[PDB]
Design a protein around this ligand. Sequence first.
Ligand SMILES: Cc1cc2nc3c(=O)[nH]c(=O)nc-3n(C[C@H](O)[C@H](O)[C@H](O)COP(=O)(O)OP(=O)(O)OC[C@H]3O[C@@H](n4cnc5c(N)ncnc54)[C@H](O)[C@@H]3O)c2cc1C
Ligand SMILES: Cc1cc2nc3c(=O)[nH]c(=O)nc-3n(C[C@H](O)[C@H](O)[C@H](O)COP(=O)(O)OP(=O)(O)OC[C@H]3O[C@@H](n4cnc5c(N)ncnc54)[C@H](O)[C@@H]3O)c2cc1C
Ligand code: NA
Lengths: 529, 529
Amino acid sequence: TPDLDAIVIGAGFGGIYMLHKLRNDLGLSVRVFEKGGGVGGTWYWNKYPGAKSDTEGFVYRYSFDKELLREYDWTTRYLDQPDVLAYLEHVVERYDLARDIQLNTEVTDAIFDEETELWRVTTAGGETLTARFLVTALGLLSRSNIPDIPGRDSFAGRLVHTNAWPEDLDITGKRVGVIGTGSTGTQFIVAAAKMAEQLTVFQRTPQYCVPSGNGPMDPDEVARIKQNFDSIWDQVRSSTVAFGFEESTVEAMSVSESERQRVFQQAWDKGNGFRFMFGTFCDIATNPEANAAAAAFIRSKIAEIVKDPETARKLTPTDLYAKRPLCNEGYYETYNRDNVSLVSLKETPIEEIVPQGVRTSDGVVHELDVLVFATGFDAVDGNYRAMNLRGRDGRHINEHWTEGPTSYLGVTKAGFPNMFMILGPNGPFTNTPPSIEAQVEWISDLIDKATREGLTTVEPTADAEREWTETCAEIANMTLFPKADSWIFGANIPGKRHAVMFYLGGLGNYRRQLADVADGGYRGFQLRG
Amino acid sequence: TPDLDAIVIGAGFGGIYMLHKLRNDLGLSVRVFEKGGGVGGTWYWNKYPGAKSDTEGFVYRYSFDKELLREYDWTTRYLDQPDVLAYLEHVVERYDLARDIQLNTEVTDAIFDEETELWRVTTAGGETLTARFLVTALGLLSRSNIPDIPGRDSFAGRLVHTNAWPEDLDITGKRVGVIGTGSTGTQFIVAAAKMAEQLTVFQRTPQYCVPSGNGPMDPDEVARIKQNFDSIWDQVRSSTVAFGFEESTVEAMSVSESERQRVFQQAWDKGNGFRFMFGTFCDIATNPEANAAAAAFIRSKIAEIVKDPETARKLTPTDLYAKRPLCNEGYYETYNRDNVSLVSLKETPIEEIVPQGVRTSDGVVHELDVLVFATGFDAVDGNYRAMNLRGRDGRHINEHWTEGPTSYLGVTKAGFPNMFMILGPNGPFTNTPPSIEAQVEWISDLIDKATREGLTTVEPTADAEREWTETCAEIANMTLFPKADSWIFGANIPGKRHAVMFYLGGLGNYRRQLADVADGGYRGFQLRG
Ligand SMILES: Cc1cc2nc3c(=O)[nH]c(=O)nc-3n(C[C@H](O)[C@H](O)[C@H](O)COP(=O)(O)OP(=O)(O)OC[C@H]3O[C@@H](n4cnc5c(N)ncnc54)[C@H](O)[C@@H]3O)c2cc1C
Ligand SMILES: Cc1cc2nc3c(=O)[nH]c(=O)nc-3n(C[C@H](O)[C@H](O)[C@H](O)COP(=O)(O)OP(=O)(O)OC[C@H]3O[C@@H](n4cnc5c(N)ncnc54)[C@H](O)[C@@H]3O)c2cc1C
Ligand code: NA
């Protein structure tokens, strides 16, 4: 007889809804552990200026509670970090979840006991409890990447990763430097150029950024949206990427040069990274002719905007448009400002970080009061491998993830009975809240089943999992996504395996795969009583 | 009994070698019908300034006569049109072939009479003759495409297609205009910019041109090449594209950026269109990420050379590097001259041709003395589809080619008994002479076999042909070539079917496939005593 029915790890979007479901709806006893000092997860950690959603606010939220969709307000098209935080803090005070969420508690070890068939969770602070069910909502983009750059630790000013932005730091009138030009880096670069006396951008790989289309929301348009929320969420759940725009059905090279130029320009004026890739034509990520047309359109726009053509040439990427889409309000325009200088790490690689700044290969000491690490995450498996996470035959999860990280259906693991993952390996690549919802609801159903039927263990088969890798491998190889050398296939981090880490079939097909398995008596599961 | 054993149509490289093989080597009665007034096909028609090979002279010749290799000399690395026409004139002289090449004579009707089992062939000149074997060497690029641009024929000065260049025209000190920036257009533009008082180029689609590396040959090097000709042709016949360079075996993205940059720079300084696509890395035409790296290198070379950054942008293409590789001596450089100007039909299309010049959408009248259409050909199936060519059940060859043009082994057609094609549909995409040699010799053997064994019909099965189409389709769709929109898939002429028309497995595999069919008792052929 364990201490709790269930233990959830992480207080991000994932963990929060998982607790609400297991305790309020299933009536079970639950506790959540979160290493951070606050609920909110990603929207707790990333306090950096510019930090905001690249999903539009209207569908970057929960949907399960129709009363909360009516009530809660948003003033801007994209949600700033503080606003996404207040939203989640409100969700916590609403379902009365705060009392069962223990903060400032990292989970160091989680061991499955083959004999008692319970999980024992072990904390940083050297406490343990037991639960029948473990749920790991650790986050795809939770565990900080800070590369071992020669001299890093010598830097005498403030050095921080964006995922540990201090509440207290004010870059106003300081010399700021940033390493990274992904979603985080770019959206910091905008907000930062407005603040810093001078901003140096350390860019190794330029990316195909499009406009966000950000600005205020008419309170009338918010009202109209709330009226038609039932309908918006039905469209979101049937889409692939679930960003709340209608996805194009049209092959990009099935129409004239003029039409292809008009469609891309329309998407450009409207804004959104995911609209540009999927809202324009159906085959930008699958067909290379189509991918070149879209990249070409963005290359041409960078030249129009970026005045100094040198700065244009450095900002212009030449590789496949197959990284996750970026959007910002005025990224390229930012580089027309006289306090912003662009250092291409292709051409002038960082030799060493000194106390005083950053020395590049050309011999220039770039003096900085503040060095920002916009260098992304150990994505997907990060906080799993760094847990002492032990299932059947006393084996660590690492032993299973030799040829890359794996799962059955994105939510369960072979030889890890009663362990569910929110956004585990080989799950959906989408707007994250409705993918979380599909997973948190599917997991709640399976647990509730075990409770009612008195099942001691639920666990997928080695076969099911192997079969699910092959399904994800088939889908991923039909896309241009594997050939983009970014975090999505784990090529971003020295000595990490270039492996498939996502089901790229979309929320529509993913929800259908969950539904089919559940209706089919939980196909590929072993249910012991 | 027929008038002739065999009729050959066309007197280019194709027809000339076929006639040698059938008459000199097999003693048969044979006549050639060339609709042009001289031998040489492509090299008779294309009389324009700058008209030269883009395969290096050393292997843009016949290989069957080891003596003719030792003797005939070449002074330049690439052969000018007069020099290739002089070469085929020497071949015609050498084997006493002129007396069986009837010139100015266009065949309009090719009818298989199933009762007599002979070919009846009608000229425009009003002769009909019967033959046992018909060999159609009509050429992949013999039928001029002259787009119906509004008000074409209203033009006061001299209008010609490049394939219809008249021997009389001197463009020296004249305002010259040209439409098309293909292999023909570009090599014209180079030679023309020297001669014309002013050259206006009407470019719809810029292409990825590399340096030729053309110049004098060291007469020592010509003799050294001759020494090792046995050895060179062996590499040519075992290669894929057969341009006389060692094809690479290195996947482009399996090595550093630094290494990738050296390899492309190496191939640039050495030169050649096909060297840059296949001499650099093994997956430039198959792997989109490799293709990007290749295209990106050329885009940055157009930036270095083209001083006027406006011109450079218009010259810089953005589609896939998946058209037939172009190379020239100093193509991009040519635009640095004062007497040359680029008009992008993407931005300012032709509204109308007028007596004086050419009016673009911007309302500018481009005053011209000479208009040159470098607008290419009805490729592969041009002079077939335009012929009254009926086989079994009286069917026209267009009933066969509704979903695109077809063949068995590139050299025969289902329902067309005793018809053979030199570079028929679904044939090799290679340096042309050694592909013609593979086919002319394979055809001589099968015709020789029919003569000895007293066969009345040789003929592929619908199945065999349908199997070949599937083989050709499986090989193509595994490349970037289909997503090009050039002449190689009939997508150059409005209305014509976007179809496969080439085996892209290379000379090596094509020769192996001919050999395999022959040695296996002509697999998929019906032989009738
Ligand atoms: C600036 C920014 C903007 C984004 N915008 C979007 C967007 O617009 N659309 C979109 O789809 N996605 C977006 N994302 C991705 C984002 O990660 C998800 O939208 C979502 O926040 C993930 O929620 P989660 O609960 O799955 O993970 P997280 O929010 O990362 O929650 C994981 C939590 O678990 C904790 N944890 C991990 N390991 C342990 C352990 N061993 N013990 C205890 N606690 C642990 C972590 O500290 C963290 O608090 C954005 C991310 C960032 C950084
Ligand atoms: C390295 C290389 C360089 C090349 N350079 C060029 C170049 O600079 N310019 C260029 O244009 N091509 C060029 N080509 C393509 C060229 O067409 C081939 O290399 C080759 O010369 C074609 O020979 P052929 O006998 O197959 O066809 P062709 O030489 O075209 O001969 C076909 C002949 O058939 C005749 N014919 C067609 N229909 C009929 C009919 N109904 N009745 C009677 N006669 C008919 C035509 O009039 C023509 O004379 C090049 C190819 C390679 C490999
Ligand atoms: Na969508």
